[PDB]
Design a binder for these strands. Sequence first.
RNA 1: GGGCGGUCGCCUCCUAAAAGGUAACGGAGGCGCCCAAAGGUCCCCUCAGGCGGGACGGAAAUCCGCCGGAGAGCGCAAGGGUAGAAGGGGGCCUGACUGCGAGGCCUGCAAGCCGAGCAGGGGCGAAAGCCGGGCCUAGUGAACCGGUGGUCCCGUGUGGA
RNA 2: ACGCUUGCCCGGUGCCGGAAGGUCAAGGGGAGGGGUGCAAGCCCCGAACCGAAGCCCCGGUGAACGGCGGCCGUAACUAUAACGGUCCUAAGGUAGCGAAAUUCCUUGUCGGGUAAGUUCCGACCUGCACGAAAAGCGUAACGACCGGAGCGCUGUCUCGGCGAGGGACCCGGUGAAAUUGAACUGGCCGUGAAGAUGCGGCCUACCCGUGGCAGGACGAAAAGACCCCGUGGAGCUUUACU
RNA 3: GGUGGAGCCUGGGAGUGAGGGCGCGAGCGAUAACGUCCGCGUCCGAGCGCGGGAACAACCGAGACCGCCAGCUAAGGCCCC
RNA 4: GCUGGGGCUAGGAGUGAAAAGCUAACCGAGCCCGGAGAUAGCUGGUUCUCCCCGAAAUGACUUUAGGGUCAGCCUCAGGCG
RNA 5: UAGGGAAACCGAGUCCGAACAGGGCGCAAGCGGGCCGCACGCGGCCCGCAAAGUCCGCGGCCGUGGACCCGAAACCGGGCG
RNA 6: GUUCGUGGAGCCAUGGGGGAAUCUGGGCGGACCACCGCCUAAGGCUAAGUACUCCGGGUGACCGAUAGCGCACCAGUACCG
RNA 7: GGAACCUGGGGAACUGAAACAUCUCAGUACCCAGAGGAGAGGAAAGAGAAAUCGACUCCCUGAGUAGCGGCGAGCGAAAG
Lengths: 100, 50, 78, 63
Amino acid sequence: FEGGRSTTLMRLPKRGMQGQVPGEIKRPRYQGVNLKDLARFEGEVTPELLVRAGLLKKGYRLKILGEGEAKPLKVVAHAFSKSALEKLKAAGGEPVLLEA
Amino acid sequence: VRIKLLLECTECKRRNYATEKNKRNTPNKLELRKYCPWCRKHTVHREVKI
Amino acid sequence: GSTRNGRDSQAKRLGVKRYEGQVVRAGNILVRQRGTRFKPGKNVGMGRDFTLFALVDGVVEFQDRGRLGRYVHVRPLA
Amino acid sequence: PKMKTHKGAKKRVKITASGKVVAMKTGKRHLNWQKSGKEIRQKGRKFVLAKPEAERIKLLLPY
RNA sequence: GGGCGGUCGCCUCCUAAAAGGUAACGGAGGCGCCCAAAGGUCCCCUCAGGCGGGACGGAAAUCCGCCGGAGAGCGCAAGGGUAGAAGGGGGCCUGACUGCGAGGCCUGCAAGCCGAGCAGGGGCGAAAGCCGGGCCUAGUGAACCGGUGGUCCCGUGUGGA
RNA sequence: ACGCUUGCCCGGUGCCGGAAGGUCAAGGGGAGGGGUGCAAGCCCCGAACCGAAGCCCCGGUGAACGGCGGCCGUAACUAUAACGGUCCUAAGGUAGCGAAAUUCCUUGUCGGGUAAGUUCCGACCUGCACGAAAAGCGUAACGACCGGAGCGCUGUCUCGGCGAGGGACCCGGUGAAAUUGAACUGGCCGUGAAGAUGCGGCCUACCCGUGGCAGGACGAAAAGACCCCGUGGAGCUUUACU
RNA sequence: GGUGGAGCCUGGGAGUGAGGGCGCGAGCGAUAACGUCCGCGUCCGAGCGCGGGAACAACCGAGACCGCCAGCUAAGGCCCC
RNA sequence: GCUGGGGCUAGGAGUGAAAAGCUAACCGAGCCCGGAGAUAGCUGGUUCUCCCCGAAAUGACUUUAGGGUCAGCCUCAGGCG
RNA sequence: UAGGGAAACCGAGUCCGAACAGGGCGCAAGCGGGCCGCACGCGGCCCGCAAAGUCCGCGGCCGUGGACCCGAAACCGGGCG
RNA sequence: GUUCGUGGAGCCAUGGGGGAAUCUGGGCGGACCACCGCCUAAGGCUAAGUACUCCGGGUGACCGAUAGCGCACCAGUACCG
RNA sequence: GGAACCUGGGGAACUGAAACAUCUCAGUACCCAGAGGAGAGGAAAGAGAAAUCGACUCCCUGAGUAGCGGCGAGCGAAAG
Ligand SMILES: [Mg+2]
Ligand SMILES: [Mg+2]
Ligand SMILES: [Mg+2]
Ligand SMILES: [Mg+2]
Ligand SMILES: [Mg+2]
Ligand SMILES: [Mg+2]
Ligand SMILES: [Mg+2]
Ligand SMILES: [Mg+2]
Ligand SMILES: [Mg+2]
Ligand SMILES: [Mg+2]
Ligand SMILES: [Mg+2]
Ligand SMILES: [Mg+2]
Ligand SMILES: [Mg+2]
Ligand SMILES: [Mg+2]
Ligand SMILES: [Mg+2]
Ligand SMILES: [Mg+2]
Ligand SMILES: [Mg+2]
Ligand SMILES: [Mg+2]
Ligand SMILES: [Mg+2]
Ligand SMILES: [Mg+2]
Ligand SMILES: [Mg+2]
Ligand SMILES: [Mg+2]
Ligand SMILES: [Mg+2]
Ligand SMILES: [Mg+2]
Ligand SMILES: [Mg+2]
Ligand SMILES: [Mg+2]
Ligand SMILES: [Mg+2]
Ligand SMILES: [Mg+2]
Ligand SMILES: [Mg+2]
Ligand SMILES: [Mg+2]
Ligand SMILES: [Mg+2]
Ligand SMILES: [Mg+2]
Ligand SMILES: [Mg+2]
Ligand SMILES: [Mg+2]
Ligand SMILES: [Mg+2]
Ligand SMILES: [Mg+2]
Ligand SMILES: [Mg+2]
Ligand SMILES: [Mg+2]
Ligand SMILES: [Mg+2]
Ligand SMILES: [Mg+2]
Ligand SMILES: [Mg+2]
Ligand SMILES: [Mg+2]
Ligand SMILES: [Mg+2]
Ligand SMILES: [Mg+2]
Ligand SMILES: [Mg+2]
Ligand SMILES: [Mg+2]
Ligand SMILES: [Mg+2]
Ligand SMILES: [Mg+2]
Ligand SMILES: [Mg+2]
Ligand SMILES: [Mg+2]
Ligand SMILES: [Mg+2]
Ligand SMILES: [Mg+2]
Ligand SMILES: [Mg+2]
Ligand SMILES: [Mg+2]
Ligand SMILES: [Mg+2]
Ligand SMILES: [Mg+2]
Ligand SMILES: [Mg+2]
Ligand SMILES: [Mg+2]
Ligand SMILES: [Mg+2]
Ligand SMILES: [Mg+2]
Ligand SMILES: [Mg+2]
Ligand SMILES: [Mg+2]
Ligand SMILES: [Mg+2]
Ligand SMILES: [Mg+2]
Ligand SMILES: [Mg+2]
Ligand SMILES: [Mg+2]
Ligand SMILES: [Mg+2]
Ligand SMILES: [Mg+2]
Ligand SMILES: [Mg+2]
Ligand SMILES: [Mg+2]
Ligand SMILES: [Mg+2]
């Protein structure tokens, strides 16, 4: 309440779509994770492990994405970025996507 | 206001507009104009009734 | 028997904003002027409302001398 | 009970990571005719000064 | 004091105390617009008046010569500035462009204004260079709900709407 | 109550009547389009046209709401209007009253009443701003209504006095009340929020009471009953909204 | 030059948005108001703590940490209270 | 006409020879309970001690001027020096 | 712990845009620092519980709840007269 | 009614008007069309887990006759209406 | 008839939006009906995207999220 006048919040417009009366479209999302950060531990890294290691809240799917050096090991994910393919490509073999 | 007839100039082939008036009182009827679009690179432009 | 005229305009607040002997950057307004009381010299550009600004950075100087108007000279540093 | 997010604020402004509040500029939506390419074009997410300490208070639980 | 009357926004000058700001039911006035040219570039010319005359002509129509440095004009009230053009005349055009915009004036915030320069593609000029409207300050209205075109971004299981 | 009357205009509004005509809802009808599907099919729109009440339009209605003017010239100076020309005009107040429960100027003017009358009575009309059923003018009787005058008589007064009873005063008995910062509480002149017992200067005043006056303590009662504010709350009105 | 309850940046926390007096520069008023409204500064508010002006917030001096039967001074006075 | 006894009429309602009178000593919409600890930007009050610093009554806006949001003035903590 | 963008989508980059022009968001900038691993690019180390955040306590403030307290004129529901 | 206030407005019940079919029949997956998935409405019943304390008892950084329930006492009593 | 609770049928106003009529307060207080030691609901013409779960009730989450709203005040799930 900025006095009886129009507040600064009300004077500036709005941009995004509010949505329809059913709500939002429940689509899955992606979670970028740094390849200088999950390169600590070792093994054929998958879900059910990285969601237990402290990161990766038990929800939507992930993708490996960071600015740093990596370790040569296997990794199974759903997506990869157009630089982490090359930073991970150094002695690294991976499937680019799961069962879908 | 009510003499200016504020309008917008159309692409004259596809899509865009240019938002400048043309008077109804003075006989400035059907004024051709070259202006800069985005895609078509300085083609001609004409009026619209809006 | 009422008040005939008691309104007044809000001031546009013109004036000299950068005096001489001041280090400036490229883009500083040297003077906000109503009419062109100051004429452009070296590295000085005018705008729409006769406002002149600096083109380069350096120590500015006024009054090269008269007979045509007051001068503003943005002089570069070497 | 638990406080409610101001939906007008959530639909109008967007708070960034380092505390800054990003919102659009005004004087653009209704009438845009007698304006230059500068005055049409320069609607470029102005910043708010000394009000975000009273503007991130209603962007509160989800930020 | 309230009521009656006047005013509620913007611009100009003074009050306003030689930076900026600054009040009163203080004084004097304007505005809710207009120009395809009254815009950009290039190229020519300098005004209003007074004197000596004229064929009508008010002492003002139109013409010549001298004096006249800005007392004219610059669309519009007032202020600033202007003939070493911004004023008057002619040719060609629409930059009365699109994406940005360094750095600033001012402001509590919201707003308002100047903007060198980069890219694309132009206009004028042989070029140097100018052009992101009008000599400038007033000519307007935040937000919300919707209308008309384009964008094909989302579109609620899937494909479309 | 009653005697004499209710004269002017239907333009605005209310009302009544209107098988001509304009507008308009739900609805009927539907050319022509849109989505989807291989199509068969399904779902959305949809302009023409028809379609009451109501509104608009015409007439009537004033013992329906409502109103009823100014201006220039003319008769032995004045005055006229009874006459001649205009209309924001629908229409310009007729009869009967009138400085009146109406009149601001005004205590208008004249006459009565008084020696003296801003009141009263009867006229004059110069009605800011009477008026015909929000009725107009009178009216025999009547009114704890109002205004004026006169008569015999009265302290009401000039101008007060005396007497009687119940209180007041004293004593015996019971014995509250609102108010209340503490007070050991003088006057004048100045100052102080601009009206001093308390502040400064001067003067007066032994302490404590009893009866009385109410000038002060801006004395008491009620958080001003007048005025203003509150985006306070209610009652009422309307062609303010729904 | 200036080490000061000076400044600059961030964050938390209030209060204030009825002001008034005085000198000057002003407007309105009547070159009237202990009148209204600004600016430049001070004071009161918040220093009704002190001395003087008889008494009195803004006229002058002075910025009260406390105590002492110590001095010197500011404004103002030296006939007596 | 006055009055006794038995009744009926009621709260946006009743009744009223019409004042907005009366309806259980107060009626321009009663009384009791509940919503309801309604609201009040409008008055008043707000309780132990000591120490340090210390305001403002200004500017920009508001169906708004006696109240507000931001800035100005103040304090605390952490940094610059 | 990665954020941009309205979303799609992309990601140490995103968006505005034809664009590596340009700009807005974040990014890495080094605190305790035996790190000399012996190449002065030192990669990164004993190592301050921190850049980096979470859980609990204790305080200031705030929102919803009556929210420092007292006090209305009134409104509605159910009834009593 | 569901968050759904008429918005693109589904579904669940319906006040009114029109109005069938019985698995090759229907409803739903948010205007709607096709595909693909879920379920049988227009009949009824159902313990257990959940709310509350007239009453019984144990506990309390709960109180100690102006506290605590209105009443520790012969209290919803005396008293008012 | 029963201190409180529950279901169904009606159902407000002050307040909040610093007025205020849609909205909030709130389907709350209040009125009526029946039953209970609980009531209601209940064996999918369900949910909603996974070819998945599998009656119903309650707590914590999801989450003040999606959404609704003079898009103001504010109200507010459901799936799992
Ligand atoms: Mg969150
Ligand atoms: Mg000045
Ligand atoms: Mg000055
Ligand atoms: Mg020009
Ligand atoms: Mg030139
Ligand atoms: Mg700004
Ligand atoms: Mg011009
Ligand atoms: Mg669907
Ligand atoms: Mg679909
Ligand atoms: Mg097919
Ligand atoms: Mg077909
Ligand atoms: Mg078909
Ligand atoms: Mg009688
Ligand atoms: Mg006597
Ligand atoms: Mg007796
Ligand atoms: Mg006695
Ligand atoms: Mg005195
Ligand atoms: Mg004394
Ligand atoms: Mg004395
Ligand atoms: Mg007496
Ligand atoms: Mg200080
Ligand atoms: Mg104020
Ligand atoms: Mg003030
Ligand atoms: Mg002042
Ligand atoms: Mg004063
Ligand atoms: Mg004075
Ligand atoms: Mg002081
Ligand atoms: Mg005193
Ligand atoms: Mg003294
Ligand atoms: Mg003093
Ligand atoms: Mg001291
Ligand atoms: Mg001495
Ligand atoms: Mg009786
Ligand atoms: Mg009632
Ligand atoms: Mg009634
Ligand atoms: Mg009646
Ligand atoms: Mg009574
Ligand atoms: Mg009453
Ligand atoms: Mg109360
Ligand atoms: Mg309530
Ligand atoms: Mg307030
Ligand atoms: Mg101090
Ligand atoms: Mg502040
Ligand atoms: Mg510090
Ligand atoms: Mg970038
Ligand atoms: Mg950058
Ligand atoms: Mg870091
Ligand atoms: Mg806390
Ligand atoms: Mg609905
Ligand atoms: Mg149904
Ligand atoms: Mg039905
Ligand atoms: Mg169906
Ligand atoms: Mg369906
Ligand atoms: Mg069944
Ligand atoms: Mg018990
Ligand atoms: Mg007790
Ligand atoms: Mg005791
Ligand atoms: Mg009794
Ligand atoms: Mg209940
Ligand atoms: Mg119900
Ligand atoms: Mg209400
Ligand atoms: Mg309210
Ligand atoms: Mg609700
Ligand atoms: Mg029973
Ligand atoms: Mg029962
Ligand atoms: Mg049980
Ligand atoms: Mg049960
Ligand atoms: Mg049951
Ligand atoms: Mg059952
Ligand atoms: Mg079954
Ligand atoms: Mg669940």
